[PDB]
Amino acid sequence: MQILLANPRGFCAGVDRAISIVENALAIYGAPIYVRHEVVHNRYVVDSLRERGAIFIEQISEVPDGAILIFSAHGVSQAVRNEAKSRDLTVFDATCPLVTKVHMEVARASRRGEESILIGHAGHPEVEGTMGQYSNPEGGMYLVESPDDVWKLTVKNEEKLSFMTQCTLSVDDTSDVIDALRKRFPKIVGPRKDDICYATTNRQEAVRALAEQAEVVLVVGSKNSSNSNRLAELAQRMGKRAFLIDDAKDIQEEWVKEVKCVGVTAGASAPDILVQNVVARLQQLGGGEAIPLEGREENIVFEVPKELR
Numbered sequence: 001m002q003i004l005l006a007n008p009r010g011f012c013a014g015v016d017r018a019i020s021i022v023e024n025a026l027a028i029y030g031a032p033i034y035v036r037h038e039v040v041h042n043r044y045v046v047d048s049l050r051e052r053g054a055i056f057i058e059q060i061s062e063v064p065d066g067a068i069l070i071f072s073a074h075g076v077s078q079a080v081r082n083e084a085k086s087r088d089l090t091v092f093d094a095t096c097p098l099v100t101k102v103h104m105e106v107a108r109a110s111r112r113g114e115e116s117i118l119i120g121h122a123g124h125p126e127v128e129g130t131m132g133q134y135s136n137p138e139g140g141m142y143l144v145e146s147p148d149d150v151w152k153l154t155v156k157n158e159e160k161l162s163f164m165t166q167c168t169l170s171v172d173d174t175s176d177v178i179d180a181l182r183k184r185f186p187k188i189v190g191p192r193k194d195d196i197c198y199a200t201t202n203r204q205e206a207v208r209a210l211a212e213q214a215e216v217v218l219v220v221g222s223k224n225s226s227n228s229n230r231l232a233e234l235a236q237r238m239g240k241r242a243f244l245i246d247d248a249k250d251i252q253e254e255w256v257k258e259v260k261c262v263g264v265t266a267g268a269s270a271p272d273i274l275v276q277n278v279v280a281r282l283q284q285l286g287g288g289e290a291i292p293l294e295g296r297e298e299n300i301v302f303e304v305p306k307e308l309r
């Protein structure tokens, strides 16, 4: 059994920055540091920090008075941001700058009264954060997940219409949703393609390449990580067995029994240490040295706020 590793995999720039914001806040002010929602969608990063003294809460009510609060990397709504500010809390915002950029366009559409369509997945926090940038009653903010959702949507003024996308969607399914919007709404405006980040794009291409060599694909990531899910899902629609695993303990040996070539990748929120242990576990079930594929270079780094260095 040959182990292949996808390239790129694992940490993106926004995730590295957000985890570092929490560590450096913890280092500058000591436990406890409150954080709204899991800072990133990874069980291991979140138990890692929860035991360094960070406390993960779901509403700003849960956070005391005079306490330090961090917004997660998935971002937050204007309402949340306001409910925090009017409560005398020190606030640090770990929202990935690639989410912020899409927030800015939403809020631009709110101000000018004009309607906006988000392509994203209901109930995901990035979605809640982004829809909640829209507040103008004159217009609207609408959510679509598929072409069918588009075929049913009606809008006040289809002449002044924009769309935005969640960063961590499938590149292919998103393409079909956009195709649907441009055909129902020939005036709609959005980005030359989508708002999907470079990391989601890259991880997708990489796992596509990996799934054409490997029979089985293991994707390191937590259940609630959208991008990680797109990775497994992509592999599966290529007809490969693919499993989303939190770590080595989840590998069932039947999955790799008699498999000539197994592939490993990692969502943008999964730390390299998890992948290393998954590789050691595969080597016990009979695999050789891990071979990384050639891949597209990533050179983007996002620095923590100056106050947190």
Ligand SMILES: C/C(=C\COP(=O)(O)OP(=O)(O)O)CO
Residues within 6 Å of the ligand: 014, 015, 039, 040, 041, 042, 073, 074, 075, 096, 099, 126, 167, 168, 224, 225, 226, 227, 228, 267, 268, 269
């Ligand atoms: C913060 C962020 C992506 C980082 O990976 P996560 O696994 O935290 O998030 P997602 O794939 O959105 O569930 C933007 O949603």
Ligand code: F3S
Residues within 6 Å of the ligand: 012, 013, 014, 015, 073, 096, 097, 098, 099, 167, 168, 197, 198, 199, 200, 227, 268
């Ligand atoms: S939105 Fe940011 S958090 Fe990573 S998966 Fe994309 S660079």
